[PDB]
């Protein structure tokens, strides 16, 4: 195949960094080496953050916040109008950044920036509206209400494989909540952040904003555990590995704070006897395939019936040998290249651990090309027949591996669904009335997201996202997810000039 | 002076009152844990505990018994609940005994609880045909995209002494019609109390033809409450209590990916500005400070007066807490019962000793009453205490009745000094300033889950959700959408076209 | 053949139901308006009427009551409902029988109208703590914004012979939280049933200490319900009845610049595709088209069958019709009671005469059944028609059981069939297929208020939304948030900065 | 004074025009002439429709709404995004019609054109919301939703004095819900719909929307006439004097529609003895002067408490002998012209009843320079001190008149405020927590808007917007108005393959 060099990689990334505002020169170093998984090469080095560096973003973020939360919520709206339209003006810019860093195919890497333009567009709706309520009381003469405010300095720290909407998803709503936010991003995507950062620094400055409202700490998880520690920042939002869920989680708790926690996933589709197969198979292929299988959303398990099932099999296994791997700046490629060697290295010990569990390798696996990159790790997606649900089928691997199970009752495909730890999304395919509703019901698919003849992936900015059981309970984006950004109060208003005297006695 | 009923008349009509409620005591009682009263301070009689393994078999039951309970639809789970309240309206006196013989609380307080727990049921009733989600559209053609809210499993319900029905029922009416099922470990210092609420609601059970494993109580101590805290069976945990319990349970649930409802400590204040209705404002906070004998958590401990109206507030309220009538809490004149224990009396002398090593003068009150009356009982004026700081002992909840009095003169410094504490539950403020009324719940005003205006920190009701903020835990029980804690959210989206968006416009097909 | 109850044997379990209700029948008897029994036609017994001037001093009364009533707070307010609902527990049966006596109802159809009342009271009580408005943010700094919700004045209920109670109801145990005081014109067919409800209600407000204006009937014909809608001090009438009545009503009460809920006909259908349960199918089409005797507003009217199936749909229903027992409403052996009256059983065999003229064919039933049994009194088997398109009588409301069957091959020719009647209340498709369940509910679907898969047009509960589009007239009464109707929205902006914008900078102090 | 001639105000109208896309040629004609308060005079005459032409534009409205209702709601807000920023790029153009043809300042008129972007912003965010709910059912086996569909086409007839912004709350909202919209604006005021309609058309083309979403009928009161009559529009939104009301509500009624009625207003504010009175005289003055009274909110009656009654005569006599009257292109200029010659004859009427029935002239009341523009009604603010709420007093008489009546108790001032037919808007000034609550209480004031410590025009996009009694009870804008503009389903689901058997007997 024919592979980007990494000097013009480089170029473009320098490029798309300084028309988003970086200045390169304040932002070089040799702490942290920023990277591509289209080469595996180095870029170039970058400073990073002390630990008393994420102390002082902090005590900015704060000092912003007390100005920010007092300032009208249409206001803090008008900010982030501003900044959505700077993000569709540096669309592409932007996108070269996230395919750069993450890997993913560009069309992906400018849906993702949408996203951030999409939830900025929703945020200035919330704007005029972060709704409590207004209710009876009991008391004569008084007025009860439901009110929200600001909490404060939010912590957000990311994974690399959504290295810009996750943030924009968690910015956006905390900022209109008069909130202030300090990101720590992925040590593999910093350039995306600081490109972010400095176009939101562009629409505060435009904006009259505080300065302090949006901070970047750039480095590797010791920083994130400091962000983590602070008595300052009452909202840890942290997305990444189930792993990372039983430290922050009860870290924050333990000091009362509040988390938002948006953990691993091991989504699976039930495919029954009435699926149209064409959709079944296109949905499938794109969610198993879909960002080399490193979205949180990522199919990794078909459930599949007995009846159906080597057609089926038959099927995504001619379709897995047609998938064009390639070059994620190349329009046709779907599959670009895993994020590095250690995640290739999971892949390659999750496949053996199948087979030695009873398992069949039905497609795909293979490193492509290696010499056209030899530091780079594009592979096929793995297709594996199971003849149960074992161990390695119940851990995620981030990587595409797609399992596929049999099963005779729906109540047992339901079952196999809820069985594994995590608890992200689910999809079943079906044309019949019951199954579907079967299927989402309170005794069906146990996930965050429960979908009907759309698959793992099937979410969108005004649903709530996240899930589960061992995914973290958090939730993002949609409905009113702004609420975890918020403090509520309740508020009792006597205008009687009365009280309830006790027994009848009288202090007057 | 004061006549306080002995221990074997408490006994008679405690007994009296399990029996009325359905309590078996023959096999309720043991010797394993004892059943006591703060009126006179004495052990009543033994009961049975549960071990370890007992809860165990219990959050099993209650798990079996959730299996069927989420599909049974949220208006019959309603019926539950109404049946329930029917029962608590009924026997009301009875189970008022037994929490004035429990918690120590006047007769008065004692119906006004259980009244609680009928208002929670009749409004829950209203709930189990709600529980709302949402329809929204979607950006996908032919597709529909919703949200729905379903159950989530075994409730784990850790009760204090102070509130020992109401704070259950709070959880157990919202969490039935949820579709839930309840695991209950009451306070220590008041089993019979949960015994007579359990024996009621499993004859509810019983003629709704529900599940028997809806509701069960384990009795014991805190390792009972660790064990129920640390099942995976347990998706939440409602837990009241200390500031001090939060570190351990909230962290312990959160490291097994469950989610919890915290209610711990407060330190509440009110702020009386130079326009209060003065009148107004010492009843208020009279009422606020030595009601319960200041073992709510709600109770008003700091009051922030405004320099120019301080010597006047304190000399009314110093005459106030003179007259409070102290008594048992059966006769009609009582306004402060006892102090629930002894450590409770220790911690409370420590404090005021602290408050005046601190540069405070006691104004009014601090001592025990007619001790000899009642030798094992702690009957105490409640104290007013002037302070020049918020000094430390001002900062930490003592679990008494204990009003420090702090002044101020521009109104951002008595917002200040209401949001200094670690603690964040209620907050109130007296005026008859409309500005300084709105500043007071601004956003830049008091910090706390609850905020008033000419009302004081117990002023909540059903309809609310009641919590704070802080140190207090950030939990909400009973009003407003309170009840999505009890449940989980889903997000569906359905598509009807029989189409998907072809990546890179590929068809596999 | 079947037997039939006697009018004195019915006369006399009348004066019973109403006696135990707390109904004086010296104080309602007279000589103005006849009560009446669609079991064998007769009148009863005479009764007192108001006259146009009792109107308006009734509504005058309901107005001075509101004036109390609307600074009771609302949880009060929900007290005194629940306290109904108590009482309409206890007289069950009673009311039931009276409903059965006037509406022709079978005894567990007349059990079950009873018990909605009960349920929308207990779904009142709830709302009574929520009522809700909201809080959000404005853009005016050192300002607060929010949207409350106030009690809006007399309500005028006018309601059908054909659900006597539970409409009130819905209604009365809404509009009486929401802070609202009731004048209700029940129709002149059935003033017992609403004579018993509003005594046992007036015993509620006795017990609750509250004001004694608060519900008042006024009996008579349409003449009285004119009066009503023409009165300047009713703000919100609530009218069920004919689309005809409609026109009448909606455009008196717009003249005055008042607010109108319309709750008028239906003439609903059900879509049945190839893949139908038909057990399923043939049973909820039975229920949906001959319950009532035909008379409920969701009566199902007309079937719209996919070809491919249409000939072993129309056998089956044929067959299950033939066996429908029909008989006297109290025993329990009843499907279907009496039309309501001769009217209704001459509107009845015109529309079947005409549809057989249009083209039609009468599979079964349309004929009188044992008219010498009873000579004044109409039972009837439920009429089956298969029709070769969609003329004039199809799309009229008969108020009868008459079920008219029409065939499609395209879904979007089904869905185009429902929409096209003036009617939109409810409609149903039966189907096994996830596509077509969800076309028929989208935007694109079915136009109606109601639109149900698998499951009859008679499918609604309380907590949703009741009501109709297009002809049926707009309104919704019971669930989600339809009590919003019953108050007025206000929009408060509160200022405590202390300064206001200066237009063009200009400052006249 | 110094006033714009009317050669130059054409020529700024017609560049206006041009530059929003407008075709001079196509809407010129002799049917309607267009004109300015500023002079008085024509400015040039247009193109009106027939009754024929009306029903045309509802078939066309109507076709267009066939495809537009299953056009995903938030494809629809991406359309009204876009319309929002040509609005933004055009906002000096747009306003200059709105002084041209309203007669409002130029500063009013640009905030105008504000508050449509503003509600664009806010619809966008609606898109994604428009919110229906799921709820339990008491059926086993059964899911309840309530589910909101867009209605059809949306009737809009609107009046001089907001001549773009009552469009924007309406075509915004109704464009989100799915709905389409037939405008009859004013006959006093055709140029600014154009403009808007042209803009609207613009981003029609740029989005790829259907074309027949938004129609201007231009015209007088018989082309509403035909609007209303119109058996394809479910929906007419109104807004016009409370005459218009009895005429409209009881039509679409008959023909079982729905309308949404923002009629006349009678606005009061309450002073009260604790009252910062150089706040309430800048409030009042501004709320009564403002836009020479020609508002729905304006300020008309001040309750002043007897106490304080000869101060605050005494400032706002002061304040309206110092209101600067001119042309409102002018920076300087506070109060522009009346519409017209018969706003100014009923304005001169009503005074002289005012007198007659017991009144005292205090200040204002006299055309400004009529030899400077003699077609055109410049006039001073009249301030009438009254001896009790008379006739006048409670006929809204839409001129720049303030009447001042004395209470002593605060349930009389109440009463007073509650005592006219009208139902807009109130306003209370105090520094007393207990009267402001009472003010806002059940038995308090009984208006649509009540407030404190702001005047008669205190509201905002993001709170419903309208009225009580002969207001008409119609909403606009904010909250959840939304719902007026489309229809609610309830929806039963049977999953369970079972219904309920009626006695117990079988039919199968």
Redesign the interface.
């Known amino acids: 195949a024919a592979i980007s060099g990494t000097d013009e990689i480089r170029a473009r990334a320098e490029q798309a960094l300084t028309r988003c505002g970086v200045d390169l020169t304040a932002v070089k170093g040799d702490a942290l080496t920023a990277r591509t998984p289209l080469t595996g090469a180095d870029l170039f080095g970058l400073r990073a953050q002390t630990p008393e560096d994420v102390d002082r973003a902090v005590e900015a973020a704060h000092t912003a916040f007390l100005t920010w939360?007092?300032?009208?919520?249409?206001?803090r709206?008008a900010l982030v109008?501003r900044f959505g339209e700077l993000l569709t003006e540096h669309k592409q810019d932007l996108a070269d950044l996230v395919t750069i860093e993450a890997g993913k195919?560009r069309?992906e890497a400018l849906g993702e920036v949408q996203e951030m333009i999409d939830i900025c567009?929703?945020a200035?709706?919330?704007?005029?509206?972060?709704?409590?309520?207004?209710?009876?009381?009991?008391?004569?003469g008084?007025?009860?209400?439901?009110?929200?405010?600001?909490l404060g300095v939010v912590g957000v720290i990311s994974a690399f494989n959504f290295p810009v909407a996750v943030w924009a998803w968690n910015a956006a709503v905390a900022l209109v909540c008069?909130d202030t936010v300090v990101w720590k991003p992925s040590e593999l995507t910093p350039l995306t952040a600081l490109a972010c950062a400095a176009l939101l620094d562009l629409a505060i400055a435009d904006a009259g904003a505080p300065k302090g409202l949006n901070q970047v700490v750039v480095g590797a998880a010791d920083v994130g555990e400091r962000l983590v520690d602070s008595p300052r920042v009452p909202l840890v939002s942290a997305t990444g590995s189930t792993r990372m869920?039983?430290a922050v989680?009860?870290?924050?708790?333990?000091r009362?704070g509040?988390?938002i926690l948006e953990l691993g996933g091991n989504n699976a589709a039930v495919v029954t006897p009435s699926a149209?197969?064409?959709?079944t198979?296109?949905?499938a292929?794109?969610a198993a395939a879909?960002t080399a299988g490193q979205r949180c959303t990522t199919l990794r398990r078909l459930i599949v019936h007995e009846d159906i099932a080597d057609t089926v099999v038959e099927?995504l296994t001619?379709?897995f040998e047609?998938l064009p791997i390639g070059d994620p700046f190349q329009?046709?490629?779907?599959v670009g290249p895993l994020v590095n060697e250690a995640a290739f290295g999971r892949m390659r010990e999750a496949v053996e651990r199948a087979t030695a569990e009873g398992g069949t390798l039905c497609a795909g696996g293979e490193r492509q090309f290696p010499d056209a990159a030899p530091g780079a790790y594009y592979v096929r997606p793995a297709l594996v027949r199971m003849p149960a649900q074992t161990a390695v089928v119940r851990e995620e691997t981030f990587a595409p591996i797609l399992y596929v199970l049999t099963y005779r009752d729906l109540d047992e495909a339901i079952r196999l669904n809820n069985e594994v730890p995590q608890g992200l999304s689910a999809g079943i395919f079906?044309?019949?009335?019951?199954?579907?509703?079967?299927f989402?019901?309170?005794?069906g698919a146990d996930?965050?997201?429960?979908?009907?003849?759309?698959?793992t992936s099937?979410?969108?900015?005004?649903?709530?996202?996240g899930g589960?059981?061992?995914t973290?309970?958090g939730?993002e984006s949609?409905?009113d997810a702004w609420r975890a950004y918020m403090?509520?109060?309740?508020?009792?208003?006597?205008?009687?000039?009365?009280?309830?005297?006790?027994?009848g006695?009288?202090?007057?």
């Open positions: 939360r007092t300032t009208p919520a249409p206001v709206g109008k195919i069309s567009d929703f200035v709706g919330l704007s005029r509206q972060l709704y409590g309520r207004t209710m009876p009381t009991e008391r004569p008084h007025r009860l209400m439901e009110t929200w405010h600001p008069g869920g039983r989680g009860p870290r924050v708790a333990a009362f509040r988390t149209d197969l064409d959709l198979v296109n949905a292929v794109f879909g099927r001619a379709a047609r329009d046709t490629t779907l079906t044309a019949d009335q019951s199954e579907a509703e079967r989402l019901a309170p005794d996930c965050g997201i429960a979908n009907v003849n759309i698959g099937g979410a969108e900015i005004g649903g709530a996202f589960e059981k061992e973290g309970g939730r949609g409905s403090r509520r109060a309740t508020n009792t208003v006597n205008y009687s000039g009365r009280v309830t005297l006790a027994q006695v009288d202090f007057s």
